[model samples]
Target chain A: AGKPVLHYFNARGRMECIRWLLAAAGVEFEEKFIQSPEDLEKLKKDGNLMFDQVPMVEIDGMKLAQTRAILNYIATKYDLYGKDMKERALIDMYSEGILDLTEMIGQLVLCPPDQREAKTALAKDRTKNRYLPAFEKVLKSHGQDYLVGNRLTRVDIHLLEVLLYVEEFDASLLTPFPLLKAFKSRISSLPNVKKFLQPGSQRKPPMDAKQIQEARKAFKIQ
Target chain B: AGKPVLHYFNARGRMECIRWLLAAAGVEFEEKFIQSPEDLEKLKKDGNLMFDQVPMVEIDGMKLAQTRAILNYIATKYDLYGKDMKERALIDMYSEGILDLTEMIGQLVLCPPDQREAKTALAKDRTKNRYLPAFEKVLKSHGQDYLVGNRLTRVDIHLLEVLLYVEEFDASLLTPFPLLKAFKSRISSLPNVKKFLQPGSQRKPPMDAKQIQEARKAFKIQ
Candidate 1:
């Protein structure tokens, strides 16, 4: 089979992590953008896709949904799953943990501005009180270099994206979690990731000027 | 460390899947019931505990949160992880899909009864139009046995639990998904799972006789 086709929104919603994994693995694929409900409906009518979700990857005439599942498939196929059982387990732990964080942050971002304070507070509590600490413990246990083992996996990419989200939300959010902050910097400095960090990489998360402006206004952050 | 301590509410919220995995793996552990907010607060005061969520597992003096992570850890430690990469990815897909359904159902269950009709309609559409059909495809892809390869992993257990939840909410809920119905039956007949179906194995809450009778009358079927 030829390379798979990935259908996703233009921005970094769920597809960003998978795109990063593909770039890190040096795999090639087609990316189709779904700009609106009409586009989604048209895509569904094509009869060659997976379920009704973005970040669906079509491979060998079979389409697969669920971002984490797709990332795991690609990681395993490319020998990025991890070296041993413990490392694999840690990968699963951090991946799922990051997913939990994403769900919380998604709610905060999508809620109406008037009602967002409570939701943001809840998200903040989950991040600071639960999610951040859990990640910190993992980083402390495994050292500040990586989430699982010494090598880079999808989990590291996920952590990078999550840290990016947190810092973009509030630069000081990482204050209490020094280990996680350090871990983020360490992962970012890796050669493959550093190359991707350059300005013109198509694989980078597509956060535009408008969205950043909206986030600043919505979050009431300077 | 000897054995981990698991704290959870009385019912099978998110922790039951992990509980079942530990049991299936023949791992010995202590299950502590956190009956009130006070109990949870006290547990939180203990610095050794890792997460603020219930169903948190304390292993080797390290606390782990997130139900999916805990289940994956137990599966890996007990050799219940799938035999190979494909099987493992399949397991991840099934489990994560189940997690998505659980979150949806949670929204419905937590809705006020007055608002339940509209929410239930939305949920029914999602289940029949989207989730059930997707799961049906998964079942067919597996050739009508288990979700991932031939072995009965934690995914099968999760599928069974979700089926039970659907049936308990309303038996007609499963009518649109025949493959899932058959899959539930197949899972119930497993030797280990069948034992839970016996008369004395089911746990009965300590509601008053009148309340129990009223519940039966309200449901009108059980």
Candidate 2:
């Protein structure tokens, strides 16, 4: 089969998790950078594009959108899905929970300042009451390094991505949950994952330079 | 391995899709119903449950949560996942899209009547512009037999379940999307699925007749 091609705006909003999973699975694909609005518009104008979203994967001329969909597809195909039915469900739970949290964070970033406060307040309540506590329970239940089973799965990688975003966005969002911090550290140190953390790794950041610069400005980070 | 046990609220909610997938795959498991506040509180006290949600699964002694995660697990293990990467991603896209729509519908159901109208309007916009069009394009692309490939995958079963809910709640919600109607009919006629759809199928909606009757009365469905 031909190599897959991934298209994304030069930023790591949702696509980065898929990039990390693909890297972990040792899958090779062309990374097309959408550096300009014109680039995005051209792709959007393509009659066969699956959705008007970034982080779309094209395989054998078929386009598929949605990052989680692509990530789960790669994970299942590579046998990185959980060992049994229950374990797999746990992975899904974790991944979906992470997606839920990410969506809330995304909304916070885009909302007006007054609206952002309310959004953040709701997110804070959810993280404190629902999201973080849920992850803490998973960590405590597993009583081991991995989230689902004894070994790493796509959910682990996805969780790591989510935690990283949380930390990047506002470390305080995670401060109340210590286990999650430790869990993030543990997953980041996984051998394959450790290598991917290197500065020059192909999965470093799935965004383009301009987008990276833009996000840095927005976040007010160097 | 021992037979898996699924713990759910005895309502269709998220678990219905997973149950349908299991039936389609011809897998057998013990379906454990967790209803009543006491049953839920006992599970929470035992530390055997996390997230305080239904549709959690236990394989052997290990417990897991999250409906989508369980579905993905079953699809992978039972070979219900699509045969190719593109097909698999397409399945993911379809499943997630259904999930997105389900969430919207859920909000409409739960929101106060005063607020439900606005929520439904937003949901309608999203369904028409984004979700429906995406599925329509996929059906057109795949030539209308299945969502992804020649045979039905878990995604098809999921689409059917979501469509059933849509029909149950508001048949008019589906009027604009004829492709979805055709897709629903196509899956409904599959031999195994047709058998499962027979009136006497053991696994139906999680709710019992008494509870559904109570709910209809409470909600004044009459």
Candidate 3:
């Protein structure tokens, strides 16, 4: 089979997580960056995007749109969801919670410069007070190396992505949560994860001012 | 076995959709109404409410939090996900799109009186312009009774719930979309869905001012 073709803007908007996921699964994917609004419109006109949104991936003889749906397919395909229904349920719940934080951070990066501080502050506050502690509790509850089962699952992959994003906000953020700190180091040290963290990998750097403007222009963000 | 315990305020906040889901699954469930702030706090203190959120369902020997997680478990357990991975992916994508509309309507019902008209107008505009057309396209593409596979799945159930929610805002909401209109009638006439729609079922009515106030106080909404 060929590599999954990912369609989105050049920024890390929502596609970065998918890149992370596919990388974690050792699946190679090609990126089709929407350079301008016309490119996106063309994709939509071609009926590739189901909801008329980007981050669509062409994989396995199917064109999938929703971020979660793509992740669910890849996770299931690569055996990252979990071993059984119960474990999968736990993974889903934990992954859903982490997704809230991920989406918050995703929007945070695109916020206007004037609102960026307050938004980032709010994200940091939620990370410290709410998200991090809850995950710390999860890691504490099981005392496992991974979030869901004894082995690593997509939940751990998702948490690692969010944790890395949060760390960009506050480098010392995980210091208060020892379990999460350990989690970061452990997950980050994985061979595949290390590959992604290396320079020039598909792991996108945080969007800068120019990239943000381009993204807004491309997506018609107000 | 005992029925699942659904916990939330007396009003239907996030819990009603879960209620819709359980009812659609032909499963009987008991409601544990959180009458006051203390009750929610007590649930949190007991380590039951992960993420300190309601819409937590006690089911199948696990206390599940996160709306999607609970729905995934129930749908999967009841054979509503799909017959295979590709179908499941399609179901997930369709369901995720419908959830955007569902959440919009959910919050539309809770918005302040002053903003209600504006919010409702926006939701109606998006539904007509964006959401409805997309689903209509899917229905047209497949020419099937269900959204994904040739049978009922959770995506169809989710669409039915959202269709009904939007219908409350505008009774003729589906007028422009005949397939969705047919979908509403067909899904509504399902034996389980019909039972839930009957008088005196567990389906909570639209939140009146009194119920909304109770909900805000119980959930500490500002």
Candidate 4:
């Protein structure tokens, strides 16, 4: 039982799934919260990021960056990823797909402040047409149950984060895909996950960054 | 030569790296090249895509999608992934970093055909300032060498593909980081990798399709 340290800006960004993973596994973690405008210099100075980004996690005194990598490490140790190689690869595939979806919303967040209005409009349509539809197809393919192997793996939590974010992006985003909704509910209602979604749990709702303000406002009114 | 069939559009796209992996590892795969705007109809009809995308590979009669998931599976079977747990997580982290970069480039590629040039310009700066510099740090870390675990895992090959794509994105992309250049050369000059880059070795130069247009154009000048 090592107390792994999770470091990132105060916002969720890519750390959302990691937070969810930690809470669901009931692991104790030391969270190092950095404020973006003021605290990013420490992340930049840390020499680990080849990409100069955060969502870095330190465990056993060795720091690792990249969100999915960190999540996989944590999951592997906790037996949450899966018990075997094929299952781990399958979990990795599912996790990577969900990780890939974050980039969509991320683009809207990264666009220039002035372009935010315009970019958000385009991103919403893209998220709907290009992003969620694929997952909807996935939801259908898996018999409207678990994403892979019909069991709850960390990767399923990863997808749950995406589906949850999609709803946050615009609640109506999932209105067209009931399978996605049910999948979200299945995980969201997981005994531990239900508590994690609320306050006082380690997991917190997406925060108050202005990019989020524009992003939350961006998705369409379906 | 056991056969694993790869289904993707008749373009490099994300499948480019997997092709390199298969060839570098000396595996035999049946490439199912689909023509777009006409043949995409067929790929969409296949039930394998949980996310309705391809670069899907068929092995053991099971269809697998998601590029990294598929790559990890292949690399695991071929022993290119890693020899142990931490190494595998490290490889996954690097692969995810490179994969995330694709979506950044992809957003521009997927933008309206008319806005392509403007999008590329923005993408180039972001790639330069935000993304690659972090990798430059990674290159400099271990005797100015490989990204992780000091060995040539598939993640190194994954990054070689990214560095190659970056050079293709901009002829001057690698100039600022000589360490990166040396690292790219290190991997590119590997006996099998060098052979894979040549003509008729089952690895082909880039071709038409907006996705790779700039990539092909940018690399030749570099």
Candidate 5:
């Protein structure tokens, strides 16, 4: 058996969701962080980055790019996708919504200082008024602990990750929705996710101002 | 058996790819065009527009939003996904790259007139240099007719659709990549796809200046 290797920067960005899913599946992984522009150039030169993008995964004897593609592979391989086609469809729908919110939060780094306040407000507004309520409605209608099939699928893992990210924006974001509040607490208590949230795990920290600068330089974004 | 109903504008925004996949699957579907902002609001009020977005599909007793989720449902229901998880992963990877190009082309209608030239040039540059070559490489490496498994999958249908979109920008976009040139010709000749390409089919034409203005008013852009 081969351990999956991840290529990305030191910050989370697109790679964090993949990290979250792998951790939820209890899969051990190794990350190769890109420290300079040359490192990224080398990956492209070596023909590893399919679209010259990071978060490229080396797994199942193939190198994969695109975040959703990587997550779909891991989710299906680990039996975390769903039991049937209909359930997989539902999982995908929910996963897309969660990723949308996650993307808004992840993109805060690129927002200019003047625009950051308005952008953050918009993200938090959508998180509270739109995205969070949609998931809360799902739990209420299904009357299940998990998002789909009453089991821990990738959507559930994705939901847990976004909830934490939203809370970092404001701790009281989940207070208005009791179901999502409980869902976050329950999912955070899972053994694997619990481990990921602990100190000294492979989970990367929230992207900060300094790391954003490093990311811009490493990608040659000047 | 309930037929699927699609709700979107008359223009081919996000729903064209869904229409293409369903046609390739030989599924007959209906479209409910959103004629005004009030129509969109009504759908949201009726709770049919999940996430309050268009390209929502009423299929199998569910209202599905998110374009990829809808396409995934159609692909799986009609057995066009793949035979196995690995093949499916490959399909997803290729599909995502194809979509990156499709999105760029789609957004051209929204681009400002002054900025359109540069944006179009950038899209064409990326298409000729990055995206098309990636698909070309896959075809050459696999030495297969299809992007995955040498059989028609959603990715094939998607490739055909984006190929058409790029050709609208410039007729000779595919000439540099012989395999993709052949791919476009081959996939377009499929019976269902060929029918869709005919004059009287449901395939919407390229977005025009009038439709763009109509779209702006219908979506309340101002």
Candidate 6:
């Protein structure tokens, strides 16, 4: 594996999941913690940007951006993408499905702060009837463990991150969905993943910025 | 070759890309145009649904959802994903960035006709703020022929599709982005893509629904 260099703000926004991906794959890489709007300005003025955004990872001498894309890349490299084409596609579908729900919960929906609870309740209806249970169904149908192929994939890690947020948001969020609740623990318990979740080298999510859960796709908190 | 089945609504919605993918891959699939609350209830019980959404495809005996995921699956099988790991990641990143921008422009600019001018003005301000310039800068660094690794990927298709709409939304949309303007024609001229654009087969933007572009995604058309 070519040494990878993860780039982002000093906080754990999007790079959190990519970090976990590297750890799960057991690959070591340098970290570049970007500071201030000055650097972002430079990134824009530099003119080499693919889409002119952060969450960019420098690996194999290329700068990759887009949150899910970077995650899928690492997943592919580690063979955590899927067992095969079909499963990879399924995993991609599930990972994005989780993203869809996150965006719905965030954005203008979760905005204005005071309305968050009411907004969350609105979001929870879909989570219960739609996202969570369907995933529970996937778990029950497929080994009662992983999201796809009975083995860990990027979606499993992604699912863990979302579950962690919901747990933080409201513990009762998972009460109606037992299979999903179990599935969360099942992914985190993996030997490599266990170590990644440990302190010392743990991830610290960004606080000054508005929390976009999409950036926090893999569980990281110090 | 085993025939694949596309399950969605009579409306074009999110399945547009998957339809484009199948055509690009030169593969045939059964198009299952589903519409009816009665059938959705049955889908919930059929036990294969992961997210209770359309834009599901049954290929190789597995169900898949999410527009990007379905598109990637076909790309992976048809070698449209990318040449390798780095390229695939780059492609994925580009694809999502386009999706992000598309959703932004879609919701803001394509809503109620009365408010469109105001919303489009705001949307156009951002395009100059970031979108078009960044794209032109990319074409400056990369080849005008395609975005990544010197070959067409899903992002290229999506970029072209959005460019088509944005130009239609405002003919002057690409005026300042010369390279993007050039790249649009290049992709449109692709033999496979052109055939997919044959008059009768052209995707009509959903008129009745307020969310025309989002509807074009995820195989759900209302």
Cα TM-score per model = 0.82, 0.72, 0.93, 0.78, 0.96, 0.83
Runs off by more than 4 Å, candidate 6 = A1-3, A10-12, A106-110, A113-115, A176-181, A205-222, B1-3, B34-42, B109-119, B142-144, B206-222
Model 1 lDDT, residue A16, Cα: 79
Compute the lDDT of residue B81 as modeled in candidate 6: 76
Q: After superposition, how far is residue A67 of candidate 1 from its true place, in Å?
A: 1.6
lDDT of 1 by residue, B41-120 (tens): 78778853444555688875457766766787788777777787667766766677777776676566455679878887
Which segments of candidate 1 are over 4 A away from where they belong?
A: A36-38, A45-50, A59-62, A125-130, A133-144, A176-178, A203-222, B1-5, B22-29, B58-62, B77-80, B141-143, B199-222
- The CA lDDT at A69 in model 5 is 92
Model 5 chain B is weakest, by summed lDDT over 10 consecutive residues, at B213-222
Clash-forming residue pairs, model 4:
A50-B134, A50-B135, A51-B134, A138-B50
Encode model 6's per-residue lDDT on B1-222: one tens digit a residue.
288888777655677767777776667667756656666667757864667777788887777777777787788888787888877776777677777767767676346679777777777876666677766766888565888778877777877887876776567768888899889889888888888777866354544344545544544432
Cα lDDT, all candidates: 0.71, 0.73, 0.86, 0.73, 0.87, 0.72
For candidate 4, the share of real interface contacts preserved is: 0.70
* Chain B TM, per prediction: 0.80, 0.82, 0.92, 0.81, 0.95, 0.83
Q: What is the Cα-based TM-score of model 4?
A: 0.78
Per-residue lDDT for A1-222 in model 4, tens only? 278888875567778778889888877787888644445566667564546566888886566888767877888778797767688777876676667677767666557789898877766786688667876776686683777667778877887877777777888877887787778888888878888888786676655577566544543210
lDDT, candidate 3, B1-222, per-residue tens: 399999887766677778888899899999888887888889988989788787899998888999889988988888888998899999899988988888887787568789899888888888888799999988999899988878988888889988887888787778899999888899999999999999999988787767666566646641
TM-score of 5: 0.96
Q: Encode model 2's per-residue lDDT on B58-168: one tens digit a residue.
A: 864557666776777778778888876677777887787788777776556557669878887877776667667777777877685778777878888888877787776
Note the residue pairs that clash in candidate 2.
A10-A207, A10-A208, A11-A207, A89-B69, A89-B70, A92-B69, B10-B206
Residue-wise lDDT of candidate 4 within B1-222, one digit each (tens)?
A: 259888886667778888888877877778888655345456667566655577788876557888878887888788887777788777877787778786677556556678878778877887778777767766666773667667677878888877877777677867988778888888888888888877777664554355466544543311
Give the per-residue lDDT of model 5 (tens digit) for B1-222.
Answer: 377999998878889999999898889999898888888889989988667777899999889999989988889889999999898888888898888888887787789799898888888888888898888998999788888998999999999999888888888878888998889899999999999999998999986789678778757731
- Show pairs that collide, candidate 1: none
* Full-model lDDT, candidate 4: 0.73
- Quick one: best DockQ, which candidate? 3
Interface RMSD of each: 5.0, 4.6, 1.4, 5.1, 1.6, 4.2
Sorted by lDDT, highest first, which candidate order results? 5, 3, 4, 2, 6, 1
